Structure formats: structure tokens, C-alpha cells
Design an enzyme around this catalytic site. Sequence first.
Site, short mmCIF file in Angstrom:
data_model
loop_
_atom_site.label_atom_id
_atom_site.label_comp_id
_atom_site.label_asym_id
_atom_site.label_seq_id
_atom_site.Cartn_x
_atom_site.Cartn_y
_atom_site.Cartn_z
N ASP A 91 -22.08 -13.33 14.75
CA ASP A 91 -20.79 -12.65 15.49
C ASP A 91 -20.41 -13.42 16.74
O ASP A 91 -20.37 -12.73 17.59
CB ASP A 91 -21.39 -11.36 15.91
CG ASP A 91 -20.03 -10.23 16.17
OD1 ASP A 91 -18.85 -10.66 15.90
OD2 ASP A 91 -20.34 -9.37 16.86
N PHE A 128 -19.85 1.29 18.98
CA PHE A 128 -21.04 1.86 19.14
C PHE A 128 -21.41 2.99 20.38
O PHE A 128 -22.30 3.78 20.33
CB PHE A 128 -21.98 0.57 19.61
CG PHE A 128 -21.44 -0.27 20.80
CD1 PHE A 128 -21.68 0.36 22.04
CD2 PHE A 128 -20.92 -1.24 20.48
CE1 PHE A 128 -21.09 -0.29 23.21
CE2 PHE A 128 -20.24 -2.13 21.37
CZ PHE A 128 -20.55 -1.85 22.81
N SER A 155 -15.95 0.24 26.32
CA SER A 155 -16.36 1.03 25.43
C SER A 155 -16.26 0.25 23.99
O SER A 155 -15.57 -0.70 23.94
CB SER A 155 -15.81 2.33 24.90
OG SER A 155 -14.55 2.41 24.99
N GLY A 156 -16.90 0.55 22.83
CA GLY A 156 -16.79 -0.10 21.44
C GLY A 156 -16.93 0.91 20.32
O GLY A 156 -17.01 2.14 20.60
C1 XFB Z 1 -24.49 -6.34 24.04
C2 XFB Z 1 -23.58 -6.49 25.24
N1 XFB Z 1 -24.12 -7.06 26.34
N2 XFB Z 1 -23.07 -6.75 27.17
C3 XFB Z 1 -23.15 -7.29 28.73
C4 XFB Z 1 -24.30 -8.13 29.01
C5 XFB Z 1 -24.42 -8.44 30.48
N3 XFB Z 1 -23.52 -8.09 31.20
C6 XFB Z 1 -22.49 -7.53 30.85
N4 XFB Z 1 -21.50 -7.30 32.00
C7 XFB Z 1 -20.19 -6.68 31.71
C8 XFB Z 1 -19.38 -6.62 32.97
C9 XFB Z 1 -18.18 -6.13 32.94
C10 XFB Z 1 -17.66 -5.64 31.91
C11 XFB Z 1 -18.34 -5.58 30.55
C12 XFB Z 1 -19.96 -6.16 30.71
C13 XFB Z 1 -17.66 -4.90 29.59
C14 XFB Z 1 -17.96 -4.61 28.17
O1 XFB Z 1 -18.97 -4.89 27.75
C15 XFB Z 1 -16.89 -3.73 27.34
C16 XFB Z 1 -16.56 -4.39 25.69
C17 XFB Z 1 -17.52 -3.06 26.13
C18 XFB Z 1 -16.41 -4.75 30.31
N5 XFB Z 1 -16.52 -5.16 31.39
C19 XFB Z 1 -15.47 -4.96 32.37
N6 XFB Z 1 -22.21 -7.01 29.67
C20 XFB Z 1 -22.07 -6.19 26.79
C21 XFB Z 1 -22.26 -5.91 25.41
C22 XFB Z 1 -21.58 -5.19 24.34
N7 XFB Z 1 -20.11 -5.37 24.21
C23 XFB Z 1 -19.95 -6.94 24.29
C24 XFB Z 1 -18.56 -6.79 23.22
O2 XFB Z 1 -17.57 -7.36 23.93
C25 XFB Z 1 -18.50 -5.73 22.75
O3 XFB Z 1 -19.68 -4.83 23.02
#
Ligand code: XFB
Lengths: 264, 263
Positions: A131, A19, A16-17
Site C-alpha cells: 500500500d 477504519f 479519519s479513514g
Molecule cells: C497507520 C497510520 N499512522 N499514522 C500516523 C503515524 C504517525 N504520525 C502520524 N501523524 C499525523 C499528523 C497529522 C495528521 C495525521 C497524522 C492525519 C491522518 O493520519 C489522517 C489520514 C487519517 C491527519 N493529520 C492532520 N500519523 C496515520 C495512519 C493512518 N492513516 C494514514 C493514512 O493517510 C490513512 O490512514
Amino acid sequence: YLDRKLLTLEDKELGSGNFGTVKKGYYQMKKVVKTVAVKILKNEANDPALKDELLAEANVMQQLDNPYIVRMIGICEAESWMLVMEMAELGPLNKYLQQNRHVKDKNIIELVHQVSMGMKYLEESNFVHRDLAARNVLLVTQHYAKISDFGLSKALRADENYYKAPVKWYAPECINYYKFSSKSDVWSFGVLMWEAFSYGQKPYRGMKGSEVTAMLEKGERMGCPAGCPREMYDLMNLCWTYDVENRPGFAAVELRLRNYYYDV
Amino acid sequence: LDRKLLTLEDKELGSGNFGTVKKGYYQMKKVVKTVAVKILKNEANDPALKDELLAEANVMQQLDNPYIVRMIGICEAESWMLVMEMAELGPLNKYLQQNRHVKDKNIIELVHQVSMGMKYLEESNFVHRDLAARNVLLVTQHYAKISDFGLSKALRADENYYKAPVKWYAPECINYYKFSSKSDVWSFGVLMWEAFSYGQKPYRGMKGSEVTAMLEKGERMGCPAGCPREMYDLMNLCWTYDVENRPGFAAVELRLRNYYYDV
Ligand SMILES: Cc1nn(-c2ccnc(Nc3ccc4c(c3)c(C(=O)C3CC3)cn4C)n2)cc1CN1C[C@H](O)CO1
Ligand SMILES: Cc1nn(-c2ccnc(Nc3ccc4c(c3)c(C(=O)C3CC3)cn4C)n2)cc1CN1C[C@H](O)CO1
């Protein structure tokens, strides 16, 4: 716009964040299903600031096509607003290195070099990220990094190389003059490099924003991470060039990383 | 200093008769500090250059004032190097040349800070002997520091002058090789003229002998375009022929403080 009926979401969030939530999902495409990561706005997206950010995010990602940038599948409006992206399975770079202290420095050089190629593409495309931090780099494999999180990104005017409007990632001209350029992304890249070689520690630990700013104005910089290759720490300090015109662009930065990886 | 703790950027910041100036990064107690590094040409084979660097460092090690560049140390490696705290914006003359928009109130502030550094040197009984706009370094557009102590001398306990850049030198330096804080005050007047002329060179197109005869006739450089009148008057007071009648830096600093307060 995507069909909510073609999208399955796993109940347990990936994280989560501010948002809202990130969820794993599966989206039916033409024939195969594709594993997706879905950004979901909190509270049915009642916050217009979150709705604006997601729409601007999607508008930017729709224009980008590069192997080191996360691909957007689409946006879905149902129960809340959702941004559907191709899944990068290993997740954010900072959390992964925190839990994998065994990753080798040569491995880290490879990953930050791929970030620099993504950012070279963005620079030649005249987009500023605004960012660029380790938390916004996603790992496809331990050897394949992609940039995500374009909520703050801006396409530059054709007559200027900066946009005029995370302080610990911001260059002096962003703090002092609200001016964001590809050069200011290079400064952030230096901090991102510092985070990578610090296995995901936070930069300027324990300092307030005003204290970071004064430190940099004095000419001081974060020290060299334990075990960090000296040439990589020298590159960080070059990214932290106070003067915008003297600071390297991503072309020069990418080449420096490519040459040093070849040496290792 | 430990050369292993110093990183130098390849592209020099500039060069001079002595060699080059490079930007660098020096690992301190915990943080790294941005430094400006004076590097002697040709592995410091010139004995005059080596002796100038060690004298320069011997002087800087003794000084502690916010308007004087701070020395970190000396490094003996591929050549001899003098490591200083970086003043980011560089020499005063080149900066004003590229920044004609700088306001007179701003310039008053900058030369007043030089006068405070020089008042400290004066009360410390050091003579600078090379006080020119090129030897003033800008930390910000509102913060100046004196550097370049290669010619400086600690005064004897029993005399107020040392007995051994003509266009910066007072008559008693040219005629008698005698250098006092008062002769630094004459140079400061030229430095003020340079600053309000946005980094133009003094006595443009004249030989040293011609400068000397001009001053002996009682003539002086004219008022720079747009220079405040009180500041041009102060330059002429700095250019007092008689060393006993010329002001010291206490009086000069006071005049600049009172005129700055008038805006
Ligand atoms: C815009 C965006 N795109 N995106 C993304 C895109 C493609 N693939 C993945 N795969 C993936 C796999 C395992 C993951 C997470 C994500 C995750 C989180 O994202 C947590 C931080 C909220 C925690 N775990 C374990 N994520 C994530 C975000 C937003 N986030 C990113 C920043 O860290 C804060 O807001
Ligand atoms: C003794 C000394 N200390 N010192 C110094 C100390 C602290 N900070 C800085 N910062 C800084 C930043 C940007 C600079 C320069 C310097 C620079 C040059 O110096 C050029 C003139 C050679 C060109 N650029 C762009 N410099 C420089 C010198 C020697 N010089 C000064 C005189 O002009 C002639 O010999």
C-alpha cells in the site's frame, strides 16, 4: 499492550479513514511523556476485518526498526482498539504538499529518497508493503519522511520473493496474477513519486480501475508533472517497467535517487 | 521526432547487424508511450544502414493494420533511430525458445495473426522479403505483429513481383531474384516451421547451397515434434515449388482460420 491510564487523547481527531479515526495523544513513558498519533477503530472495533487489520499491522511494525519507518509504541484495548505510534507532526505527505506548493523539487527529491531507503530496508527484510502511496508517508519535518500504514503488509516466505493473495498503485502482475513482491512495491513507488512531484494530486484522475489497467497494457503512462525534474520523471517510467524481472529493485532505485540528489 | 521528448534506457533490449534496440518512452499528446527504438551503430556512418532505415520507415508510414508494428517516427540525434510502438514480449523465436509450455492452439493463433497481417500486405501489394519468426513481435502471448520492413518493396502497378536469408527464400527468389507475395508465402511456411519448433533455426547445420539442392530434389524439412498434422501439411503447401500453384495469403489465412475453429 499499553495502559489506557497512561494515555491521554485529544478530543478533536487529526483525521479519519475507512477504519475510524486518527487522534493526537500523549503517552507517559518511564520519565518523559511522548507525543503519539493513535489509530482508533470505529464503532468499538465491532468489524472483525478492522480488528484483524490492526493486529496484523501491529505485528509487522513490532518487527521493524529503521529511521524511515514509523515506530509503534504499542496497542491499547479500551473503549476501542487503538494503535499507538510515535507522532510524525506534519502528517501525510500528499495533504502536506497540497497545502505547501512552495516546497522545492530538491526538497521533494530528498523526501522520496528517504522513502526509498525505508523501502530498501523493507525489501532486504523481505517484507512487502502493498500500500505504498503518498498518503502513507508521514512527515516528521519538511525534510524527514517516514513510511507508515502496514495494514496490508506481509512477511515473505523464505522460498519465494512474492506473496500470492488501491488499483491505481498496483503493478500489472498484482492486477493480473495477485502476486505482490518488492518489485511491485517499486511500481507503487513510481506512482508515489508522481504524486509527490504533482504536489499531492491523485493519480489517473477521473479514470476507473479497468481503464487504468487497459491504459497500462497499451503501454501508455501518466505524463510528466509540471516542473518535475526530467531525471525524476525518467525514474518513474523505470519504476513502471511492465516486466517484473526487468523492473529495478529498491537497491537500484535508492542509488539512482542518491546520485541525482548529489547532482542537484 | 523531437529527441527532447524521447528517453532511452541504457541497457539495450538486444543488438543486430544494424546496431541496437532499446526500450524508451516518448511523450505523446498528453500521455507517454512506451517505444522500442532501433538505433544505428557508429553514428549511422554506414550508408547502407542509413538507406535501409529510411526505406524501412517509408514503408511503415504507409501501413495501418493491427497485426503490423506501428511506427511512431524517426529521430536524427546521436545516431539515426526508428521509433516504434513497443511490443512488450519481443521476437517470436526467442519467446518460444524460453516458453516451451506454449500450447499448439496458441501457436496456431499466433501464426494466423501473422497470416492476417500478410494478407493485408498482399492486398496492399507490398512484399515483405524477410518474413521469419525473428521478425514477428509479441504484444501479448496471444497477439503477434509483423515488423522489420528493411527489405520490403511496394510492387509496381504492372507486375506482381519485385526483381532485385536464403533459408527463408523460395526457389524463384534464389534462381531468378524474383520476389512476390507468393514468395512471402514460402517464407511463411518456414516461419510456421520455426514457430512449431519453438524457435529452432531451419535447415540446421546446412549451407545455403545445400538447402537449395535439397529443395530442388523435392525434399523438405520434416514435421516438428508435436506439431499438428494439418499445420505440417499447410507448411508443405506453402513450400509448393511452382509459384503459380502455391497459395496466396487469402487462401493461407482461410486454412488457418478453419483449422483453428476446429478446436
Ligand atoms: C497507520 C497510520 N499512522 N499514522 C500516523 C503515524 C504517525 N504520525 C502520524 N501523524 C499525523 C499528523 C497529522 C495528521 C495525521 C497524522 C492525519 C491522518 O493520519 C489522517 C489520514 C487519517 C491527519 N493529520 C492532520 N500519523 C496515520 C495512519 C493512518 N492513516 C494514514 C493514512 O493517510 C490513512 O490512514
Ligand atoms: C525493426 C524492429 N522492430 N522491433 C520492435 C518493434 C516493436 N517492439 C519491439 N519490442 C521488443 C521487446 C523486447 C525485445 C526486443 C524487441 C528485442 C530485439 O529486437 C532484439 C533482436 C534485436 C529483444 N528484446 C528482448 N521490437 C525490433 C526490430 C529489430 N529487430 C527485430 C529482429 O529480431 C531483428 O531486428
